[PDB]
């Protein structure tokens, strides 16, 4: 208990507890999934503003970084906004220096490097977010995840947020490698529906896709059509 308050203190067994608590904060957010298909990547999430008093075109959880990169989060929105701005600035700097769009892996590495700094100094607090990043480079798709501690992994399909162990279990047996984009969208929506705790509508979920044409956020009409289809 004496080592549970300080960020720069190692436990006698060699553990950092505040990073575990930040991960616990991440694990209590809204669910989100991501599936990498044979020709695209799909990101889905559940909205927070589930009311009629919400202006639709005010705040979004699925955002673009470049024409071929987009991301979704699970955790604290205020921490997500500043990271999004920094990622956009880094991508623009890379394009200015090299006259070429940034690859997804380089952007993920730079963002993780930014995130790592807030876990080694006193008087600050770690970020309470985890990011899912999708991209298209050299004619093949990518999908990455980033922890509050500054570590990143590459996935074929993953889930995070509230009730994510059962979501990963569902994805394990419902996933096929040689899978198209439409069936990937169906699988993502079904995984989100597994633990929705309510009745889904085209006005409380967000979907974004990435393919050869670039990243794009789906309109509510298409989401309603997909929901009716399944």
């Amino acid at each position: 208990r004496g080592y549970s308050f300080s960020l720069t203190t190692f436990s006698p067994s060699g553990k950092l507890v505040q990073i575990e608590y930040a991960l616990a904060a991440v694990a209590g957010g809204a669910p989100s999934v991501g599936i990498k298909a044979a020709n695209g990547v799909v990101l889905a999430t559940e909205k927070k503003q589930k009311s009629i008093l919400y202006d639709e075109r005010s705040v979004h959880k699925v955002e673009p970084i470049t024409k071929h990169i987009g991301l979704v989060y699970s955790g604290m929105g205020p921490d997500y906004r500043v990271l999004v701005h920094r990622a956009r600035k880094l991508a623009q700097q890379y394009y200015l220096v090299y006259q070429e769009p940034i690859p997804t892996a380089q952007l993920v590495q730079r963002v993780a490097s930014v995130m790592q700094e807030y876990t080694q100094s006193g008087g600050v607090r770690p970020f309470g977010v985890s990011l899912l990043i999708c991209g298209w480079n050299e004619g093949r798709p990518y999908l990455f995840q980033s922890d509050p501690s500054g570590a990143y992994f590459a996935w074929k399909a993953t889930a995070m947020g509230k009730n994510y162990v059962n979501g990963k279990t569902f994805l394990e047996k419902r996933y096929n490698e040689d899978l198209e984009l439409e069936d990937a969208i169906h699988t993502a929506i079904l995984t989100l529906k597994e633990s929705f705790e309510g009745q889904m509508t085209e006005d409380n979920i967000e979907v974004g896709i990435c393919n050869e044409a670039g990243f794009r956020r789906l309109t509510p009409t298409e989401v309603k059509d997909y929901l009716a289809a399944i």
Binding site: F5, S6, G122, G123, V124
Partner: protein, 262 residues
């Protein structure tokens, strides 16, 4: 108590809350020993068990020691019977016991050192022992700073120095000063001696001087004068002007001071 920016700190607590050789050596270094200087050997029995006693006068602090030296020990023959050796962070200072030659049942103590909390009960065991005698009267003298007093007014408006007293149940006499007020308490060695006397049914009285100057000062020493008329020291004071001259001579000699204050 933060050493760097953003350090997590804990509040202080006002209620407290192989390596055996290290513990044993430390305990042996802070042990109270009673010695006989004329023979450089310890005593196998308690001091008050060896000799009969009828009166006992204890002075703690430099001012009370100076007062007793000037006004009591100036006349008569006093023989040293032992001394105590102590070590702590605040004491390297002596603790010497005498008794009157004409009346061998009258004792006197001159304690000018500091006894820590873990050495007070050892002191009591070495001096008194475990065979109390109820036909014995004890008088204790000490001094305290005026800022320790608690009052509804400001401590700067109190006319100091002044005297206060505390008595046990068997002390049938009356003090020469008002008794100490309620919310005020006394701790350390005089409290230990008074507690011993109260528990074991021995008459005793404690005299407290609250002064604004805690070093060797003439006004603080002379604040003890009213006790000279009490039954405890009535037959032990002979020449007052000689005592005043000795007090002036002693006062015109003091240790060198530092440059902190001016």
């Amino acid at each position: 108590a933060a050493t760097f920016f953003g350090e997590v700190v804990k509040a202080p607590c006002r209620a407290g809350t192989e390596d055996r050789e290290v513990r044993l050596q430390l305990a042996r270094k802070r042990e109270v020993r009673l010695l006989r200087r004329q023979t450089k050997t310890s005593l196998e029995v308690s001091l008050l068990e060896k000799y009969p006693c009828s009166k006992f006068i204890i002075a703690i602090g430099n001012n009370a020691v100076a007062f007793l030296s000037s006004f009591v020990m100036n006349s008569g023959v006093w023989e040293e019977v032992g001394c105590a050796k102590l070590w702590n962070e605040w004491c390297r200072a002596f603790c010497v016991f005498y008794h009157l030659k004409s009346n061998p049942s009258v004792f006197l103590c001159q304690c000018s050192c500091y006894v820590a909390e873990d050495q007070q009960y050892q002191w009591l065991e070495k001096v008194f022992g475990s065979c109390p005698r109820k036909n014995m009267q004890i008088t204790i003298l000490t001094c305290r700073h005026v800022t320790d007093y608690k009052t509804s007014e400001s401590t700067g408006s109190l006319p100091s120095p002044f005297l206060r007293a505390l008595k046990t149940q068997n002390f049938k006499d009356s003090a020469c000063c008002p008794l100490l007020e309620q919310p005020n308490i006394v701790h350390d060695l005089p409290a230990a001696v008074l507690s011993y006397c109260q528990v074991w049914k021995i008459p005793a009285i404690l005299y407290l001087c609250y002064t604004d100057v805690m070093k060797l000062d003439l006004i603080t020493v002379e604040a003890f004068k009213p006790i000279l008329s009490t039954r405890s020291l009535k037959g032990l004071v002979k020449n007052i002007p000689q005592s005043t001259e000795i007090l002036k001579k002693l006062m015109t000699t003091n240790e060198i001071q530092s440059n902190i204050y001016t």
